[PDB]
Each structure stands twice: as structure tokens, then as C-alpha cells.
Design a protein around this ligand. Structure first.
Ligand SMILES: O=C(CCC(F)(F)F)N1CCC(c2nc(-c3ccccc3)no2)CC1
Ligand SMILES: O=C(CCC(F)(F)F)N1CCC(c2nc(-c3ccccc3)no2)CC1
Lengths: 186, 186
């Protein structure tokens, strides 16, 4: 509604600058509403970012669910959900990652979804071991945890152009290599 | 001197609480000096953390240099330098990681050492490929980047007891598995 215009404005401004340099006034002005009208839809600019991040993590989650309904290509398509979804929302991903430090709600959102994505990873590794396609090496949930944390750090360093980082055009191939060798390697 | 007592005090208090809840007064009081005497040695409590982190990253770096003067055990000993060094300084590591967001000096320190550690990793992978012990798969510097970023995120999640995290007692074996399979796996 006006809610969607507030969310579009905040995502648009986050591309230009950090949430510290965005006023509820910029957000109201972008959405064609007054400041007190903003406060009807959101308590803070921090609450706007939480909603933007909730939409992006659920978009990734729903795409992974769709997939779940050649072993290298299987993992590549799964990693690609996160590459494309977060890569299509870099400003929100970057701001949301930074807000984990200062928002308990943002930290718990991120934590909830990582636990879900790790549990799905471990379940697929377990299924691969059960069909005899993968060796019983590390505990599957521990392997999944380290690989998902690798993806989190690597994808977000690439998207931010951090030094150091894998170039964005090389990051999917890099991560697929490490997943497939670590999951199938004896 | 008095400098060492300020640094010992700050590391001691960081174990109890975050740098936000430590006053220059706590630091002065711990070191048996006055507040203005503190300002003779350090401009801010933020400068104390920068020095503490510089000492820890250089301790790791010097231990790695010592090492550099069975392939699974080679990588295990190298990863162990970082596990033991950072694991022996969890309060400083945790505070230092958080300060990357709000200190350019802390972010550039961390960046400098990651670039060095990635370049050393890539050089060892290159040497392993040159002696025919490792296959020419991914670009060595891209593989090294992702593996080092994996270690950074995984070690620091374990030490902080984040949810999710690999249990501290399982994190070295977890990371050695993923390094050896990804470096030696075809
Ligand atoms: O990368 C992230 C999370 C990234 C983040 F958010 F930063 F951590 N992944 C988490 C989920 C992984 C997965 N794929 C499949 C699958 C199942 C069926 C068919 C195809 C694939 N199951 O689990 C892909 C990689
Ligand atoms: O884990 C980190 C960095 C961790 C951080 F800081 F979080 F990123 N490592 C970076 C350095 C790696 C390495 N080991 C050896 C070696 C050489 C000779 C003999 C034995 C080992 N060469 O490179 C070990 C893992």
C-alpha cells in the first residue's frame, strides 16, 4: 500500500547510503506521506530494514523449497538461489548483515534461517550418504554448518567488494567446488 | 610499562563486558594510573582495542612464519595456529571483529593480515600443484580466499557460541576436512 512505497523507498535509498544517513523524513517523502503517517506503518527506520530483510530471506527460502520439490549441478542450483536472491538485493543484504550487530530482531531472523538452511543441507548430505553417493566422513550437520557459514561470509564479502573477496563473477564456481569436493571426497 | 598494565586491564575487562561498557576510568583504575595519565599512552579506549588486536594478529602471523620455516597434518598444524592463537584471546578477537564495522583502522588491520594469509595459502597450494601433489582445479588465490573466509567466520562463530556454530571441540577437524578435500580433490 503506502507500506510497499515505504519499503521501495528504503531499498532505493540504501543503494545510495547507509541506514544512519536515511531519515524517517527521506522515507516519508519517498512514499508520498507525512512523517506521522510513516509512524502508523513502522515504529522506526530500523523496523523498515527488518521487514525488507524478512522479505528477502523468505524469497530465498521459498525458492529453495521450490527446488526441493548430476550431483555438482544439484548443489550449484541450490547455492545459486542464494547468489541470485541476495545478489538481486545487495543494499538490503549489506544493511541487514550490519544490523545483526545492533538489532536482536535482525540477529534472531538471520539465525533462524541459517539454522533452517543448515538443517536442509545436512538432510540432503544424509540422503546422499544413505543412497551410497557420498562417503560417511564428518558429521553431516557440522559439515553443513561450516559450508553454510563459508557461503554467508564469501557471498557477502563479494557483494560488498571487500578486500579480500572472491570476484562476484567467480564466487558461484568457487563455492560449488568446495561443497562438491568436501561432500563427495573421501 | 604502564602501557602493558592498560592493555592487560582492557583484555581482562573485555572478558566480562563489551568495550561500550568499559570507561577509560575502569582502564586507568585497573592500571594503577589516573585518567589524564591514560591519555598520555592512548587517545581512546578504541585505540587500546586496536593495539590488543594488532598484538594478537601479529602473534598468529609470527607463529605461521615459524611453521613455514603428511598433507592433512601440514594443513591441520597451520589452521591450529589460528585456532589456538585466537582461541587463547576470545574477548579481544570478538571485540576486534565487532570493531571492524566502526573503526577504519581495525578494518584495514584485519584486511591487511587476511590478504597476507590468503597469499601464503595460495603459494602453498601452487607449490603442492607444482610438485604434482594437488590437481590444477580452481584458481589457487580464489580457492584460498574462500577457505580463509570460511575459517574467519567459522572460528569466530564457534568462539562466540553463536547459533549456528560448529562446537569449538569439532571446529578444527571440520575445517581440516574441507581444506584437504577441496585442495586435493579432483
Ligand atoms: O548457500 C546457502 C545458504 C547461503 C547463506 F544464506 F548465506 F547461508 N545454501 C543453503 C541451502 C543449500 C542447499 N541446497 C539444497 C538443494 C536441495 C535440492 C535440490 C537442489 C539443492 N539443499 O540445501 C544450498 C546452499
Ligand atoms: O585459518 C587461517 C587464517 C584464519 C583466519 F585468520 F581467520 F583467516 N589459515 C591461514 C594460513 C593457512 C596456511 N597454513 C600454511 C602452512 C604452511 C607451511 C606448513 C604448514 C602450514 N600456509 O597457509 C592456515 C589457515
Amino acid at each position: 500500500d503506502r507500506e510497499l512505497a515505504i519499503l521501495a523507498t528504503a531499498e532505493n535509498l540504501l543503494e545510495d547510503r547507509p541506514l544512519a544517513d536515511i531519515s524517517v523524513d527521506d522515507l516519508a517523502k519517498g512514499a508520498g506521506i507525512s512523517r506521522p503517517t510513516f509512524y502508523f506503518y513502522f515504529p522506526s527506520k530500523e523496523a523498515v530494514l527488518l521487514t525488507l530483510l524478512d522479505r528477502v530471506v523468505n524469497q530465498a527460502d521459498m525458492a529453495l523449497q521450490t527446488l526441493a520439490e548430476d550431483r555438482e549441478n544439484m548443489w550449484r542450483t541450490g547455492i545459486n538461489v542464494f547468489f541470485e536472491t541476495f545478489g538481486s538485493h545487495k543494499a538490503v543484504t549489506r544493511a541487514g548483515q550490519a544490523a545483526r550487530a545492533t538489532s536482536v530482531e535482525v540477529a534472531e531472523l538471520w539465525s533462524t534461517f541459517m539454522q533452517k538452511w543448515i538443517a536442509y543441507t545436512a538432510a540432503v548430505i544424509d540422503a546422499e550418504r544413505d543412497r551410497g553417493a557420498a562417503p560417511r566422513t564428518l558429521p553431516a550437520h557440522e559439515l553443513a554448518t561450516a559450508l553454510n557459514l563459508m557461503n554467508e561470509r564469501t557471498l557477502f564479502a563479494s557483494f560488498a567488494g571487500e578486500q579480500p573477496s572472491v570476484p562476484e563473477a567467480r564466487v558461484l564456481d568457487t563455492l560449488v567446488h568446495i561443497w562438491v569436493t568436501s561432500i563427495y571426497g573421501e
